[PDB]
Symmetry: D2
Subunit: 115 residues, 4 copies
């Protein structure tokens, strides 16, 4: 599991459950090609997006559908989605955890890169 | 100033100066059209991006070029840029301040929306 | 204004108005002596807490009463308050802006230090 | 394990390892009584601070020694420590995770409260 995404809800102090997200890889034409997708579990985590062999160096975008999450809770959010755009690099550590902390008008995202 | 962006550097405890950013607006064909661009001042603020007349309702993307900022400082960061995507002026004209707080492996973005 | 505090509300996307805060300075006996206090304005800012002459070197604690803020709004938050503790003016006089971004279960605080 | 603390480093994009912290419980005299302490592991987590029977309702303070963490890395931080002050409440979910995201001039803290 080279890539895992964890989403937290700062209003309720909980994992953000059933949050959909799509991962894209930047192609040579500079368009975003679909790569992987899924929805967070009861723990707010999405595991199994990709494999080591598949996740090669390149630029990736994780598009988290935060608007649908907030609307399902009856809250009107600011952002259309949360976007995390980054280069995967073999010179560094092996495993990427992308964390996203969600509020209606704010979000933060953090990368924890380990071996 | 219907749209203003302020950027802070969490490593130095300072405004983030000379941060470039590009604003796009979603066209009717669902492509991102260039809207405005600029760089932050010594206060870390970018004013004057647009006018009330030109900033119509739509979906806007503010791409803050954080990697270029960190690389100019000799730091290799995680993200390519920060991408703030939002619907603007759907209730009528509003004033938007987008704040961004930058660290090499993490950032947060917040919107202050006033009438 | 050697010390200023700005507070934002990540749920409403607005300045956090009427947030009370109490500033303390560590005395020679290692107890927290009351230093200054105030509340944020409609802009979410608190100015005029102290003067250059009175804000000497020391360890300061800014206690932002976030629970009182959220409870006045009918939200039960996690934290009692946010506590920002720092050494000030150890290199000579500086200007400090303490920013705080509030959600019910999360907050961040950042310092901008200028000479 | 009713209480767990996780600390992340936003400069290196890593768990913050060997971060010391002390937990205090507010006594009836309104003084902070030592409760538990430890240091984060290689995963940035501190487990086993307390037990269900011991962690009764009341106000607790987690004081994370962030200054020593940054100084050990050769970086001059703003804050003396990070402070998380909160009420433990039996009316809510059973397990508390306190997360802290550290930068030299900024930190965020989040509570994830689950069953
Ligand atoms: O709460 C957070 C959290 C809060 C604000 C920013 C980042 C994180 C974060 O990265 C994070 C993790 O990586 C994690 O593994 C468990 C967490 O609870 C968090």
């Amino acid at each position: 599991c080279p890539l895992m995404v964890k989403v937290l809800d700062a209003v309720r102090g909980s994992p953000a459950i059933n949050v959909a997200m799509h991962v894209f890889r930047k192609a040579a034409d500079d368009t975003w090609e679909p790569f992987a997708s899924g929805k967070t579990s009861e723990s707010g985590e999405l595991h199994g997006l990709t494999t080591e062999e598949e996740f090669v160096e390149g630029i990736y975008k994780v598009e988290i559908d935060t608007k649908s999450y907030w609307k399902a809770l009856g809250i009107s959010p600011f952002h259309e989605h949360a976007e995390v755009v980054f280069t995967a690099n073999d010179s560094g550590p092996r495993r990427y955890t992308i964390a996203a902390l969600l509020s209606p008008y704010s979000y933060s995202t953090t990368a924890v890169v380990t071996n």
